[PDB]
């Protein structure tokens, strides 16, 4: 069963700003999502130092980048801590409130959209390139869930029926028709090169056959 929720007013406002502002430096989305994946990997690695059984769901700690030209999707997979149902519906939105409000105030004061990460709301930059975002996630303490939004003020959460992922998060970006450059190997490599040194986990780019 699928449940539909409204985004918090400030998040809905930020999403409409990101979608409707003319902004050509769209490549920032990839650095933001990789940074988030790295933070989720730090979380599970840290927890595993006091409880090694936290890695029973998978010991490999990495990030995979999977472009798919046929489906027009860019998938970012990590084996981080994952997210609970409470994270998806409430708690991430609550933690984001101050940063979202502060980021929109900064933008009105002439700040650049590339500053989004400095406000802890980097995820929403995915809407610069994606018409729809699907997030499949699995936390040790909960079931596997699918979160999805095409913006427009709402998102859905459902228990995922698909392939079990063990632990971690898969972000599926359904790219806008004019944003297919982010499916090119050379383009992905170029973007990641301005970021991989700060990432303490292997980033593997899957080459299409
Ligand atoms: C509903 C959208 C969720 N995203 C796709 S996300 O927030 O960008 C994002 C989240 C995680 C994630 N898993 N576990 C966890 O704690 N995090 C996390 C990391 C950083 C900040 C807040 C967070 F919860 C991830 O592994 C990759 C992501 O792209």
Numbering used by the authors: 16 to 224
How does the study describe this entry?
Here we report the investigation of the role of protein flexibility in the modulation of binding kinetics and equilibrium thermodynamics of drug binding to heat shock protein 90 (HSP90). HSP90 is one of the most abundant proteins in the cytoplasm of eukaryotic cells, comprising 2–5% of cytosolic protein under non-stressed conditions. It is a ubiquitous molecular chaperone intimately involved in a variety of pathways, including cell signaling, proliferation and survival, and protein folding. The N-terminal domain of HSP90 (N-HSP90) contains the nucleotide-binding site, which has been the target site for drugs interfering with ATP binding and ATPase activity. The unbound N-HSP90 has a highly flexible lid segment comprising residues 107–14137.
For 7 of the 20 compounds, it was possible to obtain crystal structures of the complexes bound to N-HSP90 with loop-in and helical (8, 14, 16, 18, and 20) conformations of the α3-helix region (loop- and helix-binders, respectively). In complexes with compounds whose R1 substituent exceeds one atom (compounds 8, 14, 16, 18, and 20), these residues have the helical conformation with an adjacent hydrophobic pocket lined by the side chains of M98, L107, F138, Y139, V150, and W162. Steric clashes between the ligands and residues 105–107 would prohibit these complexes from existing in a loop-in conformation. All ligands occupy the ADP-binding site and form typical interactions, which include hydrogen bonds of the 2-hydroxyl group of the resorcinol ring with the side chain of D93 and with a water molecule that generally mediates interactions with G97. In contrast, for the helix-binding compounds, there is a large favorable entropic contribution to binding, and most of them have a binding enthalpy penalty. This switch in thermodynamic profile is thus directly related to the conformation of the α-helix3 region with compensating differences in enthalpy and entropy of about 60 kJ mol−1 between loop-in and helix-binders. Protein flexibility is another possible contributor to favorable binding entropy. As previously mentioned, the N-HSP90 crystal structures show higher B-factors for residues 103–111 in the helical conformation, suggesting greater structural flexibility of this region compared to the loop-in conformation. In the helical structures, however, the Q23-N106 interaction is not possible due to the binding site rearrangement, and this may contribute to enhanced flexibility of the helical conformation of the α-helix3 region. on can vary significantly, indicating transition state destabilization playing a role in prolongation of residence time. Helix-binders reach up to 230-fold slower association rates, when compared to loop-binders, indicating a higher transition state energy barrier for helix-binders, as depicted in the right-hand panel of Fig. 6.
